[PDB]
């Protein structure tokens, strides 16, 4: 039950999209979304 296994590729995809965008304007919002995802924050606000 290695969850980290999938998370390795998941954060890989995140880093992948990081270099895909890497643009500090409008895409910077998507960039911030990767950061948000890396913060482990989903729809679990309340």
Give the residue carrying structure tokens 């998941």. Answer: 10
Domain residue ranges in the chain: 1-46
1: its two tokens: 């039950």
CA–CA distances in Å: residue 28 to residues 12, 18, 37, 45 = 19, 10, 14, 23
Chain-centre distance of CA 7, in angstroms? 11
The closest alpha carbon to 32, from 17, 45, 11, belongs to 17
Experimental method: NMR
Which residues lie below 8 Å from residue 22, measured CB to CB, with a gap of 6+?
A: 31
State the Cα–Cα distance between residues 31 and 12, nearest whole angstrom.
14
């Amino acid at each position: 039950g290695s969850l980290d296994e999938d998370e390795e590729d998941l954060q890989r995809a995140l880093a992948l999209s990081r270099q895909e965008i890497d643009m500090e304007d409008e895409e910077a919002d998507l960039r911030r979304a990767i950061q948000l995802s890396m913060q482990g924050s989903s729809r679990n606000l309340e």
